[PDB]
Amino acid sequence: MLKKKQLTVLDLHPGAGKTRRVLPEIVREAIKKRLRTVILAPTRVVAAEMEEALRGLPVRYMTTAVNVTHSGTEIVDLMCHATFTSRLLQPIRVPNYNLNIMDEAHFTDPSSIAARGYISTRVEMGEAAAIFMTATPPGTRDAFPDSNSPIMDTEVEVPERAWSSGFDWVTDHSGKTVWFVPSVRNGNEIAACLTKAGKRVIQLSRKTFETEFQKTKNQEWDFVITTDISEMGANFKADRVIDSRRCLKPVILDGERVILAGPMPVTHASAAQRRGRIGRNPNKPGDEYMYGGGCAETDEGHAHWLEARMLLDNIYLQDGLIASLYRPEADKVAAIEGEFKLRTEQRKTFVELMKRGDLPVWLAYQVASAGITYTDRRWCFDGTTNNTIMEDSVPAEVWTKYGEKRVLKPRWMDARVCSDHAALKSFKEFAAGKR
């Protein structure tokens, strides 16, 4: 697989040993052939598990998740998918890796889609080799792949709100359950219902993942309530997965706003990855998978793919050439290559609104493309009356950097800045000039 010009998809079933067995062998072969290599982890939690599997091999860990003193003689770098894309965007030269390995290559966050598009383009050009590691490559239609041990698959009605009766099977279980919910707010209601029933519940989401995932190892628990982030390599010692089979879909309406549509069905890849959390121990047959809906290709028209085109249009590749999306996922968005290419100063603003501002890609692009500078926050208050952001059914208010109390009313409305309490608190700090 290491020969130039080729992209290999390593699609072994979940738990087949892609990370702990195949990855170290690939790395040893790459170091033997003197290939400058990058290893891309979806999260800092996966990067730490990779360090355990790669111990004894010269790897440069470009992440604060690992505490290792580097020798300086490493030709293999390890970083998360988002750091790879961010460094490509920033005015820092990234080496032209001869071998690019992406673990959990099914990750649908805009930065992972951009990384696959950039790497696959370099491979098409004949400059590099790549290995995409995932049980569920783009376009997979099988939500029931193979496993290390047999799984009991049961289609059943799964509660998406607090319940008082009709779901005895949920609480009458004596093992550990991983339950996938469509959103943080939906998880809060179910966790509260399970806590009132006497269950020990841990909740996981993108922002709290690294911190709260440690609790799954450090303390006894009955249920883990998680968004889709746990589809990316998160391992549990559990015997059941309850799957709502639903997710939220960011959708761009009329090219002027982003809504969080749904909950709606997950893709086959997401369902197979959610189910993939169990049936991993060959000595423990009969782990359960309870699913409450069907699958659909909800990645079509999903804003993450349009956002990946905004990132790819602003990454230098060669003169005016622009990287295409990875072919199997390239029809998910109606987009013309280069339509989002920004001039030098506007691109620097676009990068800073994402990196320091913490804004979603689409929103950062609207602000940068309008000729607004990073610290100018007047756009957070000059939108139409229908863009008024609501908190507890009352308009959200902030003291501007001038000392004036104003209602948060952004010129461009992106529902992701207020998807939960923590998101809106962060956006209010942004509108106030606090970062």
Curated annotation (Swiss-Prot):
Post-translational modification (record): Acetylated by host KAT5. Acetylation modulates NS3 RNA-binding and unwinding activities and plays an important positive role for viral replication.
Residues modified as N6-acetyllysine: K207
Topological type in the membrane: Peripheral membrane protein
Feature type site, description Involved in NS3 ATPase and RTPase activities: R274, R277
Lumenal side: 1-435
The organism's place on the tree of life at top rank: Viruses
Subunit (UniProt): Forms a heterodimer with NS2B. Interacts with NS4B. Interacts with unphosphorylated RNA-directed RNA polymerase NS5; this interaction stimulates RNA-directed RNA polymerase NS5 guanylyltransferase activity. Interacts with non-structural protein 2A. Interacts with host SHFL; this interaction promotes NS3 degradation via a lysosome-dependent pathway. Interacts with host CEP63; this interaction disorganizes the centrosome and inhibits host innate immune response.
Protein name: Serine protease NS3
Provenance organism: Zika virus
